[PDB]
């Protein structure tokens, strides 16, 4: 009937984070806005849905009551976050609201029916695996920053998980770089390929890399529509699937390159962020002028001016530069999509194998062995 | 003569910042000016004109002008402690770290405006901790509404040797002031809302916040030297400003004394759960406790209790046998409460539909009235 219980006001505090960064809050089109709360077993069972994913998040509390209601999100979180008290208790009083109660304060917020909360979907796999947490992280965090904007692309505005073999791998393209990053599986696992939309790929590395769950283990269920994670035990995040094929990728990563370029990664992305400054958003593009005495980095912004950075060649650590070649080659590239790639892999140094202006680079991180990306120039 | 200059990085993003918090095509420009061992940035929007030198490494006196957020967006991220600008002419003004060149493209001076002159009415000396106390306590209720124009701004006025500044939006009263040593020319002028907040963050700068302040005013402009180095020329709003005190509460019949922080927090908390269409906090006060209560129509209600207490950090006193249930917006209370630094804060009433004076003991010379809502 009417819950009530007695919570930690920090771990209700962090749950009410997560149901925020789920709720539907943008105020264009009409949106569903509450949080359901359902106190069973000694757990607090906190939900939130929008029209991608469902999250159910569990608790421990006392409960003095099972039962279950529904309050706006944004005004729970938003007093919650304000309270002093090392602990709250949570009554549904019916019609009078949820209370909110703390030492010397009351909050009643107005429910609404549990009937108006969306239904959490049931979810019959076809396949079934678990990974570790930092592994899921990583092949995300790899993959997330290319995903394509573009609805009509509707296949590729989703990362693409999928197993070849023994390797679970995410791939993600938006037709100007490609991302690809993977870790090997134990056991054999059914091949399967489905594509996950953007916001899910968001909200579920927001939930792997909490600190109580970075070192966890989280099982993944999925069938050609629904996939389902369960994080830790106590954290189930369902989310649609986008229905599309993605692309034969394996086409897009070059066979041979006629130069390489060995650089220090941060001195790469510092570099690049400064020239870049000088762009407009008409004409996002950094001139690379390569030899293998120096590497002049420049652009030029209409209205504004122009910018040149110099690189000169360094076997120190901290200033590496050798580029391979006799011969020079001046290319462009979106310095957003390098330096997607550059700060997506903590390495001292990178790799970025060229063939001619035309075409694509390749990048790698030598002691990255399992992340690959390839973007195509811009004329400049 | 070409500019040539070598600044320290971390003095010419400072300069850059004030530059770029006041900004015609021309106006978005930023002139600069290598003369006499010393860099003078000049910035101008239609209230006010900003004049920032810094010390400087001068190689060749000249002049050039760019786009303030060209200049801004470059500087700020370049990594080395100093750098070297040289406007080379027909390429444009370089901005040189050491392994990096920027190169702007230069406008012509003679589009950018000169600070105009000022023949003063009154001038005088103050010390920038007290120009800063008076706009500090006086900025936040400055009327938005353009309807209201000659409310836009601080009342900036003497009586006698009382160096006032007020501001008014209909809603609240906060007037602050510093007593002068020198006899002055009666005034009072209106200060723009811009012109306000730009000072206050020139006077807070830490390089001034510790020295003087110089005001030049007449009817029609005033001007402010702060410790020599920075000038700023503002146009004034041409208005009368209206008689503020009767605001003031003729006398009061109840007093309420409580923990400054306390009483803000909540609030703070209470106002929760109000909505934008009443944003309204009922105080509920008497002897033995205050209650701060709200309401926000299909949203929910909230009450926090606070009990009598003598203890510093959770004073709590009020000196009546009736009781006494007033609203307030909540914003209006929460503006007073911030802008001044006291561990109590006083709050006198009168009735139901009568204003709230709030004074901070230990600083007499801040007062501030906020008017009740129907709760």
């Known amino acids: 009937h009417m819950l009530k219980l007695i919570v930690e006001t920090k771990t209700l505090v962090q749950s009410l984070g997560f149901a925020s960064s789920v709720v539907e809050k943008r105020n264009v089109i009409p949106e569903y806005a509450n949080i359901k709360l359902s106190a069973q077993d000694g757990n607090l069972e906190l939900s939130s849905t929008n029209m991608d994913l469902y999250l159910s998040q569990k608790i421990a509390v006392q409960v003095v009551s099972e039962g279950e209601c529904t309050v706006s999100t944004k005004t729970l979180n938003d007093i919650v976050r304000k309270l002093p008290d090392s602990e709250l208790t949570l009554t549904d009083l019916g019609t009078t609201g949820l209370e ?9 917020l107005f ?3 549990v009937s108006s909360f969306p239904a959490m979907d049931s979810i019959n796999p076809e396949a079934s695996f678990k990974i570790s947490c930092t592994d899921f992280a990583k092949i995300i965090e790899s993959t997330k920053f290319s995903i394509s904007l573009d609805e009509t692309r509707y ?3 989703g990362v693409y998980l999928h197993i070849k073999d023994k390797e679970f791998c995410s791939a993600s393209t938006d037709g100007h770089r490609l991302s690809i990053s993977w870790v090997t599986l134990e056991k054999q696992i059914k091949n399967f390929g489905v594509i996950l939309p953007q916001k899910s790929a968001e909200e579920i590395l927001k939930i792997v890399k909490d600190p109580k769950n970075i070192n966890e283990d989280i099982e993944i269920l999925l069938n050609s529509n629904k ?4 994080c830790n035990e106590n954290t189930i995040m369902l989310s649609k699937l986008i229905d599309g094929t993605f692309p034969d990728y394996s086409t897009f990563i070059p066979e041979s390159s006629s130069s390489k370029l060995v650089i220090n990664r941060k001195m790469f992305a510092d570099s690049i962020e400064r020239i870049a400054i000088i762009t407009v958003e008409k004409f996002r593009a950094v001139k690379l002028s390569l030899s293998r005495e120096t590497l002049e980095i420049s652009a030029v912004g209409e209205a504004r001016g122009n910018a040149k950075e110099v690189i000169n060649s360094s076997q120190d650590k901290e200033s590496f530069y050798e580029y391979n070649s006799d011969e020079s080659l001046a290319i462009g ?7 997607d790639v550059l700060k ?10 060229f063939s001619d202006v035309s075409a694509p680079v390749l990048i790698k991180f030598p002691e990255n ?3 690959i990306f390839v973007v195509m120039p811009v004329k400049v």
């Open 344 to 353: 997506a892999v903590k390495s001292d140094l990178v790799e970025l194998y």
């Open 155 to 157: 296949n590729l505005n």
């Open 111 to 113: 429910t609404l029916p």
């Open 333 to 339: 590239f979106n310095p957003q999509y390098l330096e």
């Open 100 to 108: 909110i109660k703390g030492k010397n304060c009351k909050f009643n």
């Open 227 to 230: 996939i389902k994670f369960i």
């Open 369 to 371: 062995p399992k992340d």
